[PDB]
Structures are given as C-alpha cells and as structure tokens.
C-alpha cells in the first residue's frame, strides 16, 4: 500500500529490494552494509537512507543498546532532509523518529519532530493527536489542551482526542466537565482509548461528584486488565506481589524499622514540631488535587530514594536514624515525610501510583477524636508512638474533624517480596 | 510534576530506553 519509492528509486528497486530482503531475513549486519553501500552510491535516495535507518533500528533492538538507536534517530532525520521524498515515506520516517525519541525519553526532541509532522501534514488528525501526547509528556497541559480542542472541532467524534481532553480537564479539576469526554472516548473503542489512565480518572471523577456508576468503570477496567482489582487501582506495578490493604509489622518483615520508629517516636515528633514552629515553609501544601476541603501539608525528607539535604537540616536526628534502613531510604517509589492535617479536612478517596511500596504511618500528634483513615474496607485510627502499615495502591480516604492539628510520619518501604535486582532497576516514581 | 500520593500526571516515570 504505502508508496515509498520516488522516481529515481524505482530505477534502483532491484538493489533496494535485495538490501531490504537481507534486513527482513534478520541478516542485520549484511543489510546495514548493503544499505550503506546504496547510500554512498545513491546519496540522494530516500529509500536507501530509510533502509539504513531501519537497519540501525533493528540493530539497537537486537543489541538492546540505546547508542545504536540514537544513530538510527539521526538517520530517520536524514531521510526527511533528502529531496523528492514521497509523502508516505516522509511520514513513516519522522513518526518512527518521534516514537524512538520517546522510547529513549527524549521528550523535547520528540515534541519537535511532532510539530514538524503536523506542519508537513496539516490534515492528518492522528498526527495532531500524537502532537498532543508530545505536549503531555513534557508537562505542557495548556498546549495539549489546545491541540485536542482543534482535533475535536474538526473531528468531534475522535475518541482518542476525547479521552485525552477529558484527562486534561480532570487534571484541571474540571471534574463534571471531564466525565462525558472520558466516558464517550472509552466507549468509542478507538485505538488508544483502552487505557488504564482513563478508567482510573473517569471512576475517580464519578466518585467525586457522587455518581454511583464509578465502580462499574472500575470493574470494567479490572475486566480489561488495567487494575489488579476493583479496589487496588495502581498503574505502575509488578504483578504477583501480595496484595492486601493492611499489613502487620511481621507481615512486612521490616520489624527493626518499626521498632526504631516506635521506640524513638518522641524525637521524630519533636523535630517535626520544631520545623512547624521555626521553619514552617518547609511544609508544602499537598498539590495533587486530593482534597475535597481543608489544610494538608507535608515536609519531605526523602523522595525517589534521594535525601533532601536541606530538609534534613531541620530533622537531623530523624534523618540519621533513618539512614540505617535502606528499605525506606532507597525506596525509589516512595517517600519519607512528615504530614500535618488540620480540622475540616477530607481527603478524596484515591489510590497511589504503584503496588511496589507499602506505607508506614507513625503517630506523632494525634487528637483524641476526629481523625481516621479508611483503606479499602477497613477504617483505623492513629496512636501516638505507634505504626500503622497499609498498601496505598488500594483506595484510601482520610478525615480530620478534630479541634487541633494531626501530625504523622510517613515512611514508605519497598514491597517486601521485591527482589534486590527489582529494587535496583524499577524506574523511580 | 511527580506522582507522589496519586496518579494525576499523564505519566509517572521518566523512561530511558532499554
Ligand atoms: C489521605 C492522606 C494520607 C496521608 C495523611 O493522612 O497525612 C494518604 O493519602 C497517604 O498516606 O498516602
Ligand atoms: Mn494517599
């Protein structure tokens, strides 16, 4: 179907086909050398250049080397720099360039390739959708929104644009408005719409507006493999890890960590209280749209397995104490942080992002009544000097209706069944 | 933006190839 040969390339199709045959037989090295010969003999040939690139791409795949794939990315660009490139080949080449840039994590350069693609092919709606994703991946939600509004104005029924518009709206706290877009885009069945993110956020928005249908979408997402279960809706996970909402110290195997937190709880408290009194700006408001109302702030000592040195100046003995426990200080998918919540606070039901951590809560200042945390189908209360442990990849909710502040200490650990090599390689969250 | 307590970002990891 695709027309990849311009006028001159049709006159050397025999050579081009011979080289491509080598590539599709898996004789990568031979194909590479054959296409390099064709590029030196026919330096303006788009199809020869594309063969060189595709061969480098296959080579990176076989060698699992990013270095080789960067070479291929430049060759994909070279293709588009030649004269008289057929439109189908131009698009294939720059699309694969963008996709491999994203694979490597080069989101800014992928964005650039996508802007070029949309300029070259102004009527291809799918390229505009891909450009929207490019904007999302660098955190530019404002431009992603404009892109999908353009798509929807020319193609109102595009399901991919619908779910992504809905996702942007919901992240902007436009909850009610987001629901029809997320729902209709998932129901569209269009490619790219069967995505856990959209089931997760459609169900959440429904829950927040009181729509009792949210768990139908949770059950559909579970049926389609995005969620380990209805209640545990994390999206970055290692399948097979024991899944339960509440853990005992012994169940975790981190008994020394728990003992250390409990036996020393007063110094942990007192350093947190000194930061409250004399360095309150180290506590930062929760910024993930998880509150229905109230005041909630966190003072973070570790995130993604990286110690915040400035932060630890304010809790130096606590940081020194925790250094002895790599199971938390090296948990690249958790945090260590103080958490203060004030009266009148309701945290929306929500899920954390990964089933790869468990979450310890050490009580520090706990009002006698008004404070409680539900996880899945179990509600519990804190106690000063005592650790609770739950899997925050399960849906959980918190209320603060006391008459004064509630201070806890949050220590995330690696899920205990994760192997050493898993703990070392899983990308940080 | 990072995914700390929730799943609000379009992606929560920053991948780096193979
Ligand atoms: C719901 C708030 C709770 C933290 C806190 O109570 O301070 C939470 O979501 C978590 O620990 O993940
Ligand atoms: Mn939480």
Residues A60 and A171 in one domain: yes
Residue A1 located in a structural domain: no
On whether both A290 and A326 belong to a single domain, the answer is: yes
Residues A100, A130: contact at Cβ < 8 Å? no
Torsion on CA atoms A163, A167, A168, A173, rounded to nearest 10: 140
- Judge if A152 and A41 occupy the same domain: yes
Torsion angle of the four alpha carbons A204, A206, A211, A214, in this order, in degrees rounded to the nearest 10: -60
Q: Which of A238, A240, A257, A241 is nearest to A249 (CA)?
A: A257
Pair A286, A381 in one domain: yes
Q: CB of A275 within 8 A of CB of A317?
A: no
Q: Whose CA is nearest to atom 5 of ligand 1?
A: A339
Cβ neighbors of A293 (< 8 A, separation 6 or more) are A344, A345, A346
Give domain status of residue A169, yes or no. yes
Q: Which domain holds residue A423?
A: 234-429
Ion ligand 2: residues, CB < 5 A: A 392; B 5
Residues A256 and A357 in one domain: yes
Instruction: Indicate which residue's Cα is closest to atom 12 of ligand 1.
Output: B5
Q: Which A residues 18-57 touch B at CB under 8 Å?
A: none
For the CA of A410, the closest atom of ligand 1 is 11
Query: Rounded to the nearest 5°, which phi and psi values hold at A406?
Result: -120, 120
Residues A317 and A295 in one domain: yes
Nearest residue to A23 (alpha-carbon basis) of A11, A14, A32, A36: A32
Are A141 and A266 in the same domain?
Answer: no
Q: Cβ–Cβ of A235/B7 closer than 8 Å?
A: yes
Q: What is the arrangement of strands in the sheet containing A371-375, beginning at the earlier edge strand?
A: A291-293, A345-350, A396-400, A371-375, A378-380
Same domain, residue pair A329 and A303: yes
Q: Based on the structure, what is the number of domains in chain A?
A: 2
To the nearest whole Å, the CA of A84 is away from the closest chain B CA by: 32
- Contact between A48 and A38 under an 8 Å Cβ cutoff? The reply is yes
A341 is in an annotated binding site: no
Please identify, among A183, A211, A233, the residue that sits at the C-terminal boundary of a domain: A233
Q: Is A339 annotated as contributing to ligand binding?
A: yes
How close is the nearest chain A Cα to the Cα of B2, in Å? 7
Write down the residue that tokens 């990315």 correspond to: A73
Contacts of B15 (CB under 8 A, 6+ apart): A103, A104, A105, A427
Task: Assess whether A309 and A268 both reside in one domain.
Answer: yes
Q: In residues, how long is chain A?
A: 429
Q: Looking at the domain assignment, is residue A317 inside a domain?
A: yes
Task: Write down how long chain B is.
Answer: 18
Residues A67 and A141 in one domain: yes
Q: Show the ligand 1 pocket: residues with CB < 6 angstroms.
A: A 339, 341, 347, 359, 392, 396, 398, 408, 410; B 5
CA-based nearest residue to A301, from A332, A335, A331: A335
The closest residue, in CA terms, to atom 1 on ligand 1 is: A398
Strand partners, A303: A306, A335
CA atoms of A370 and A377, how far apart (whole Å): 19
- With an 8 Å Cβ cutoff, are A353 and B18 in contact? no
- The residue among A214, A233, A252 that closes a domain is A233
Q: Is A244 exposed, middle or buried (0-12, 13-18, 19+ CB in 10 A)?
A: middle
- Say whether both A240 and A228 belong to one domain: no
Cα dist. A329→A42, A389, A411, A414 in Å? Answer: 57, 17, 9, 10
DSSP symbols for A254-287: -HHHHHHHHHTHHHHHHHHHHHHHH-GGGSEE--
Q: State whether A221 and A333 are in the same domain.
A: no
For chains A and B, count residue pairs whose Cβ atoms are closer than 8 Å.
73
Phi, psi values for residue B14, rounded to 5°: -120, 95
Q: How far is CA B16 from CA A65, A70, A426, in A?
A: 11, 12, 12
Alpha helix locations (H) across A155-235? 159-171, 175-188, 196-209, 214-223
Q: Are A57 and A103 in contact (CB under 8 A)?
A: no
Q: A406 among the known binding-site residues?
A: yes
Whether A165 is covered by a domain: the verdict is yes
Distance CA A367, CA A365 (A): 7
Residue A267 backbone phi and psi in degrees, to 5: -70, -35
Alpha-carbon distance of A116 to A120, in angstroms, equals 6
Q: Let me know if residue A319 belongs to a domain.
A: yes
How far, in Å, is the centroid of ligand 1 from the Cα of B6?
10
Q: Which of A235, A233, A185, A175 is nearest to A205 (CA)?
A: A175
Among candidates A121, A119, A146, A116, which has minimal Cα distance to A132?
Answer: A146
Q: Give the integer Cα–Cα distance in Å for A418 and A235.
A: 17
CA pair distance A117, A98, nearest whole angstrom: 9
Residues 6+ apart with CB under 8 A from A24: none
Q: Domain boundary residue among A233, A257, A285?
A: A233
């Amino acid at each position: 179907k695709p027309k990849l040969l311009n006028k001159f390339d049709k006159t050397i199709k025999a050579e081009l086909d011979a080289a491509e045959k080598l590539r599709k037989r898996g004789k990568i090295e031979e194909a590479v050398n054959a296409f390099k010969e064709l590029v030196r003999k026919y330096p303006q040939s788009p199809r020869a250049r594309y063969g060189k690139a595709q061969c480098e791409d296959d080579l990176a795949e076989k060698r699992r080397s990013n270095e080789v794939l960067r070479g291929a990315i430049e060759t994909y660009q070279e293709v588009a720099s030649l004269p008289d490139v057929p439109a189908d080949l131009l698009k294939l080449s720059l699309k694969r360039r963008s996709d491999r840039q994203q694979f490597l994590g080069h989101m800014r350069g992928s964005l650039l390739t996508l802007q070029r693609l949309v300029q070259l092919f102004p009527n291809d709606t799918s390229l505009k959708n891909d450009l929207g994703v490019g904007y999302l991946l660098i955190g530019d939600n404002d431009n992603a929104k404009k892109v999908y509004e353009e798509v929807l104005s020319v193609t109102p029924n595009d399901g991919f644009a619908k779910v992504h518009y809905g996702f942007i709206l919901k992240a902007q706290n436009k909850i009610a408005e987001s629901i029809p877009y997320l729902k209709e885009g998932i129901e569209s069945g269009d490619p790219g719409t069967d995505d856990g993110r959209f089931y997760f956020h459609l169900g959440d928005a429904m829950q927040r507006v009181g729509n009792k249908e949210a768990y139908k979408w949770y059950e559909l997402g579970h049926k389609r493999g995005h969620f380990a279960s209805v209640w545990q809706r994390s999206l970055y996970n290692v399948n097979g890890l024991k899944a339960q909402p509440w853990w005992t110290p012994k169940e975790t195997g981190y008994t020394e960590l728990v003992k250390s937190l409990e036996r020393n709880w007063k110094l942990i408290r007192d350093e947190g209280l000194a930061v409250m009194d004399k360095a309150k700006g180290l506590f930062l408001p929760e910024d993930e749209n998880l509150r229905e109302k109230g005041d909630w702030s966190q003072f973070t000592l570790w995130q993604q397995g990286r110690r915040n040195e400035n932060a630890c100046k304010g809790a130096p003995k606590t940081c020194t104490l925790l250094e002895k426990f790599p199971e938390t200080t090296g948990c690249r998918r958790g945090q260590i942080k103080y958490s203060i919540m004030h009266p009148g606070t309701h945290v929306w039901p929500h899920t954390g992002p990964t089933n790869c951590r468990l979450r310890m809560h050490l009580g520090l200042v706990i009002p006698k009544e008004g404070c409680k945390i539900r996880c899945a189908n179990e509600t519990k209360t804190w106690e000063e000097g005592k650790v609770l442990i739950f899997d925050d990849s399960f849906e959980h909710e918190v209320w603060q209706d006391a008459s004064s502040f509630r201070l806890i200490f949050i220590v995330d650990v690696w899920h205990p069944e994760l192997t050493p090599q898993q703990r070392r390689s899983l990308p940080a969250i | 933006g990072k995914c700390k307590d929730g799943l609000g970002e379009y992606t929560c990891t920053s991948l780096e190839g193979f």
